[PDB]
Design a protein around this ligand. Structure first.
Ligand SMILES: O=c1[nH]cnc2c1ncn2[C@@H]1O[C@H](COP(=O)(O)O)[C@@H](O)[C@H]1O
Ligand SMILES: O=c1[nH]cnc2c1ncn2[C@@H]1O[C@H](COP(=O)(O)O)[C@@H](O)[C@H]1O
Ligand SMILES: O=c1[nH]cnc2c1ncn2[C@@H]1O[C@H](COP(=O)(O)O)[C@@H](O)[C@H]1O
Ligand SMILES: O=c1[nH]cnc2c1ncn2[C@@H]1O[C@H](COP(=O)(O)O)[C@@H](O)[C@H]1O
Lengths: 224, 219, 213, 224
């Protein structure tokens, strides 16, 4: 199960389709507890924080099944993936701990990279990538929009010759701006809106909000 | 904030309206991790367990503001309300522990009653005379259980009486809670402590009772 | 898997509990204590997180013992509410992530209170969940009434057992901790209905006893 | 509350003393659920994972009081402080959300720096540190042993002229090798032993184990 041709990277071949959130589907912010610093700026909730956690649990189970009994090197793309990545590795460990079928291989080995995208150029702040040579690698990203970040990071990783490369992203946007790259383990498919909350930011703001929400015309102005 | 006329009980007067879940609107069970004993029987998830939790956090916040600084007696109607009740008391305690404005009264005093048509079995209610009482119920359908118990509780002379219920069904008129998580369509739900002949309580999400479920578990 | 009725209360074949030595405690000032409890809590015998870590292991032991079997778990209200809710969360999660699949639910829950119809427990595997065993009187007497209905098997899960001077003391089958003989409050444990919502297991202090007697 | 002379960095001046764990005081591993990959190696548990969580809640409350009202920039020292830092920011956000207060300022601003120490040399992998000029900065670290890493990193951060600089560390060791640096928000004071578990590693092993254990002889030999 862990094996996968390197050329399938970014194709999402053989993936389990993500949960589909239809266009214009939102919950009211007023039905949730919204902290004061966020209250003026949040109107519509796309993904309740608890719904995110439920979905991440299923993804972790899918990931556990793929890499069962294999060494798994998981890369957190900082800053955005922090929340998703921390949830995923907590579930991977717990699943492994309670599994009725045991292994002497740890559930994962964690790695961190900082990607700064300019759409154009991609900056990388990370340790040497040669460590990934011959490893099963799982890249964790918060959201895929155009696909640029993961495509060019993907080429830089293929150069060191990993054993396999897969992508986990919490959300994928349905957008005409996409280069067609898709993830292998995807939480949700959403319409083309800018989201905030649950680590998603807008100019470094709103990461601590517990739910995934849509901007607000209001908020774009005060924080642009 | 805590005072309120006893005859307002069951009217939902001045409440914050619940989250409205439109008819025929569900998540696909295949998008969630479903345990093997439930796999064959769950197809439509009405309320993900996380959505439940997020909503209960908000109700606990509304409850905390309603009884702030007041002695609050909360009654759990067993067995169905235990998961919501347990979630609610956990948020109440945490909200009070992290509050700026401090207090010497505990966040709640807990009490338990059970079901028998079923009615509540509640060992000597005279301890509720002159107390602020909050009754916690898993779901309100016809409103019979809460109406019948509410009359018996009124008889001991509580200081106030309010209802928290996770879900209220839209069914043909009717008793309403004060702190209500969700308004849903008139369907039978299982999971998250909701049962169908004692089955499905431990499933983590709120699902619609399927045909397969009904046929397998019908008494 | 399931066992002789006469072994009830003996803890026969059990895994001994974590043994907390006499006079061993944490300082309450190292923890966050809410204002209603702060005047009264000084010594923490069991941090709430240690209770949760230990309940995880007991739930795993219970999962193993009843694997594949229909398990009816009885919660002795009100004190056992915290422990029982922890236990059933873990039992369900362990089953859900096991992957070593089973069609029976992880448990069927049941509730009893202190001063009902036990007939439903005839021919059932029963686990009685109790918050703490002190003299053992509560579980001895309840056990005799449950034995009268003819359960298939009976075992006891108790979060704590006190070390008393009593001989032939009732022992549980899945026990979290052995502690010194002192009154404890917090984590659902009470003193005249006070302190249940505090997050940690504390020793009842003199101030607490005098204030809440 | 949040102001403090830059010269006091590393002195733990005016701090709330940590929980003191006496020498040779531990829990037995058999009383906990230990996953198959760790089972042969864990004997002694110094700090159950749940005791860590309860302690970090108190430390989060202390931090919350210290920076109440101000903009707090908290830096996660990768990789070891990942789990501590994640717990910390969860608590800070939850504390603020439930507070009587109605702040308009977010509970924190997150930042990540990977440090690699050689006792010597210190490699700093991060985004530009000059964004911390005139900010209240809290450095989050997993454990202070010699104090070398935080002394050297402290000097590199003083060069951008932060408004204040404090240190949160989950554990500090009672050692002979220490240069005397001590943290301002410290969870525990422990005897001088190597610890693994709860993100603490021994050559990149054991991070996912849920409890803080002492490195055993079986672990050393196996992972030396
Ligand atoms: O809706 C959004 N909210 C917050 N960040 C986003 C959003 N969409 C894209 N991004 C950011 O842009 C990066 C990837 O964009 P891509 O390279 O166009 O696929 C993510 O890793 C995020 O940092
Ligand atoms: O859809 C359902 N699923 C599970 N239990 C239900 C459902 N609808 C009603 N009940 C049970 O019926 C009891 C009382 O309903 P009511 O008295 O008609 O309002 C509730 O306390 C529930 O536990
Ligand atoms: O130290 C204690 N704190 C709180 N309740 C206790 C304590 N010791 C005994 N109890 C209560 O007394 C009952 C057990 O007493 P026993 O029958 O003497 O074993 C339990 O149901 C508890 O709820
Ligand atoms: O007992 C230990 N277990 C795991 N890592 C440790 C231990 N002691 C020190 N370290 C690592 O060594 C780094 C440097 O500690 P220093 O000696 O104070 O510079 C810390 O940030 C830890 O990551």
């Amino acid at each position: 199960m862990a094996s996968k041709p390197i050329e399938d990277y970014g194709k999402g071949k053989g993936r389990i389709e993500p949960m589909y959130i239809p266009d214009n589907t939102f919950y009211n912010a007023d039905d949730f507890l919204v902290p004061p610093h966020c209250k003026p700026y949040i109107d519509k909730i796309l993904l309740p924080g608890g719904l995110v956690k439920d979905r991440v649990e299923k993804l972790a189970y899918d990931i556990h099944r793929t890499y069962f009994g294999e060494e798994l090197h998981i890369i957190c793309i900082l800053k955005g993936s922090r929340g998703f990545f921390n949830l995923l590795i907590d579930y991977l460990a717990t699943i492994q701990k309670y599994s009725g079928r045991e292994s002497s291989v740890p559930p994962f080995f964690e790695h961190y990279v900082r990607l700064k995208s300019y759409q154009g150029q991609l900056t990388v702040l990370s340790d040497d990538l040669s460590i990934f040579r011959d490893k099963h690698v799982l890249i964790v990203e918060d959201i895929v929009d155009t696909g640029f970040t993961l495509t060019e990071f993907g080429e830089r990783l293929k150069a060191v010759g990993p054993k396999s490369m897969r992508i986990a992203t919490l959300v994928e946007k349905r957008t005409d701006r996409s280069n067609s790259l898709k993830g292998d383990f995807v939480g949700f498919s959403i319409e083309d809106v800018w989201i905030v909350g649950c680590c998603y930011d807008f100019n470094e703001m709103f990461r601590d909000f517990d739910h995934v929400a849509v901007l607000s015309d209001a908020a774009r102005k005060k924080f642009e």
